[PDB]
Ligand binder design. Structure first.
Ligand SMILES: C[C@@H](O)[C@@H](O)c1cnc2nc(N)[nH]c(=O)c2n1
Ligand SMILES: C[C@@H](O)[C@@H](O)c1cnc2nc(N)[nH]c(=O)c2n1
Ligand SMILES: C[C@@H](O)[C@@H](O)c1cnc2nc(N)[nH]c(=O)c2n1
Ligand SMILES: C[C@@H](O)[C@@H](O)c1cnc2nc(N)[nH]c(=O)c2n1
Ligand SMILES: C[C@@H](O)[C@@H](O)c1cnc2nc(N)[nH]c(=O)c2n1
Ligand SMILES: C[C@@H](O)[C@@H](O)c1cnc2nc(N)[nH]c(=O)c2n1
Ligand SMILES: [Zn+2]
Ligand SMILES: [Zn+2]
Ligand SMILES: [Zn+2]
Ligand SMILES: [Zn+2]
Ligand SMILES: [Zn+2]
Ligand SMILES: [Zn+2]
Lengths: 138, 138, 138, 138, 138, 138
């Protein structure tokens, strides 16, 4: 009946963090996380691409109205993450190390509480232009 | 026998359009398409990445000669879409809303009339740097 | 004294247009404007970088509060140009060809009506990644 | 038990090469490879994105420590390829045409000698911004 | 005579900060700095372009050996700023608000202590792709 | 009077080279040129931005017809440099080290033979995204 496609939107947020696990010693944390372990933290301009998939509406031509996607991303990414210190301002990271992997997972989870079932396809997080994580709910 | 790979080429074209469905009222169109419904239209520098897949030739080292891909894309994308008004200059859009989704579908279809069977893998269309559609023939 | 610096902000707007001069005939307009003379128009995702200059405030560390710069650009660029047909929705282009040069000049003039005297340093307009105009009020 | 994700790192290297097969005549090589057949060669700033996949560590939050990935890529890509003439400085290309396809294959193979089994997911090679090859070991 | 040219090198550093002035009160700092006044900070992937000018050497063809330029920038930018909290790890920012303007000024001053007299021409700092400051020692 | 503006056009060419001076010995060339002194060469995807300046025509709205600018650049840059080995295929580099500086100078000189007197304002050459030279005929 209807064609299926993937629709993506990109957004970026600014945040600080420090890679550190209290399960690891002061020295193991330094060895494992290196410079990212700097005691006072550091930061990034994160770029997030959220992809949803579904059938293309025969009337509107939309898999999902980009206005709605913007709103979901505002709620799932921008409000809790933008201009925040991940480890101190985001409850989820009080006990989870804020690697790019876990930021992708956190965003995936947040989006799932809001998006229609089966809509979310992928969450791609660029920590820098050179470090990227793709999480697809697996 | 032979290794398989995906080969992609990017091209960009300039076009104007207006998101509007005559199945929707003047006001519903405004609600659904917002600013994209501007009566006199607006435009974009579309970026299209076309991916074909196949075995890597044991002699030439090519999945498909990029010269041929350029030619197919010139014919399928540039000739009908570049420096055009999608809704008024492209017959296909006389009755289809010109969303990014439908531009990807249109390009996929165009390429299929020309490419060897099983060659086309994906058509990725960037309407802006922030709005992207991936269509894989599903 | 106080240190002087240049502060720039980038914005993108979507718009369509047709390069056409009523002073020229149908054949001249084609010769001069080529593919951009497409009767039904075409469009671009314009990127504009606005640079203002001045002294770095000794308390706030700002040449101009970027919040303020955003508002100025919102009023001078986004509001009148975003998602518009330059030649039909913008009075200025009624009798002025909408080349990248004239868009840069139009934006410069709009900002000058709003900005503090001497604040504006440069307006840079990318019609595409390859076609760029810089205007400095000269 | 544990979430799985894809982790990617990008690196770029500079290299010269000439597309030419001694199985093809002087003239066939010209027809097939065109400008890329220039007798004295030409060059590129290659961009390579290497993706590995696996479970996200419950303690460190890493699929693979980026420090390790950097080291593997230094060894598999940078040492043999950076600031080299592919056809004359890389033994593998003495008998294989240095197309983007074969550079991706070469890097995939190199990484396989070093990476833990099942870690490598994809090798994406940008010869230019417009010519890209994705090889996934198929 | 000898030809004169401008030679630029780009580097990126990761850092966090809070825009906050002790001269201002809690409410003023919020008014002035908005979201960047987040108590626990935030961060960016800063990009810095350093331009030096001078004569093109008649033997080496260099204005300055880029190896040398790299070292200068490594000492002036990377070492003191990369993976740091600007306001707590950099003495200069103890009593100077860390806007993009002051980061550009701080970098300019660091380079001036190291570079040959008259070599430095410009320091360009991108806090984000959209917020840019150019400092030329004025 | 007539308004004056700067019109820029970007092009990319692929080329290889070896940084080596016959005036220097084998050890000096290694010290000075390092990895770029690789005997068999290496290459880059050079990006060149050409800026011309002048009055904005009152009828066409152009400083110079971009069609014309394209042709000039095609003749001055693409034709002699694209898909070439700079030191063996370009006579100018027979006795001139092919640094980014000399490539910018060579391009400037080529454009000056073709362009209207006083039209050329700047030649910007990116050897890589990180190494840039600006030449203004000084
Ligand atoms: C980039 C640096 O500041 C830090 O965030 C860092 C260092 N090594 C890492 N390694 C992995 N696998 N994931 C990360 O997010 C990561 N992150
Ligand atoms: C971007 C804007 O000008 C307009 O083209 C627009 C607005 N909402 C949209 N929403 C979807 N899903 N797809 C679109 O192509 C789209 N397109
Ligand atoms: C780029 C093309 O589609 C068309 O808009 C066009 C043709 N040549 C041009 N020439 C100049 N000088 N300025 C332009 O904005 C311009 N623009
Ligand atoms: C880009 C050009 O310099 C040359 O490397 C070239 C020309 N045609 C090609 N075609 C394919 N399929 N793959 C290539 O790597 C390729 N490569
Ligand atoms: C960008 C935002 O998060 C914050 O850091 C901010 C607020 N407005 C600003 N305004 C100026 N002039 N400079 C800045 O660096 C600046 N920076
Ligand atoms: C970039 C590197 O591979 C090599 O080409 C190199 C070495 N140092 C350099 N130094 C200068 N000044 N200019 C160059 O073009 C240059 N280029
Ligand atoms: Zn980090
Ligand atoms: Zn649109
Ligand atoms: Zn146009
Ligand atoms: Zn090549
Ligand atoms: Zn900030
Ligand atoms: Zn080089």
């Amino acid at each position: 009946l209807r064609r299926r496609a993937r629709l993506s939107r990109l957004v970026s947020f600014s945040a600080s963090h420090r890679l550190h696990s209290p399960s690891l010693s002061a020295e193991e944390n330094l060895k494992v996380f290196g410079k990212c372990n700097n005691p006072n933290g550091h930061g990034h301009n994160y770029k997030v691409v959220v992809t949803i998939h579904g059938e293309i509406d025969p009337v509107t031509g939309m898999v999902m109205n980009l206005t709605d996607l913007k709103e979901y991303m505002e709620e799932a990414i921008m409000k809790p993450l933008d201009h925040k210190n991940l480890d101190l301002d985001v409850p989820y990271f009080a006990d989870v190390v804020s690697t790019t992997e876990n930021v992708a997972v956190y965003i995936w989870e947040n989006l799932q509480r809001l998006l229609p079932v089966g809509a979310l396809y992928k969450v791609k997080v660029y920590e820098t232009d050179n470090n990227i994580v793709v999480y697809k709910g697996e």
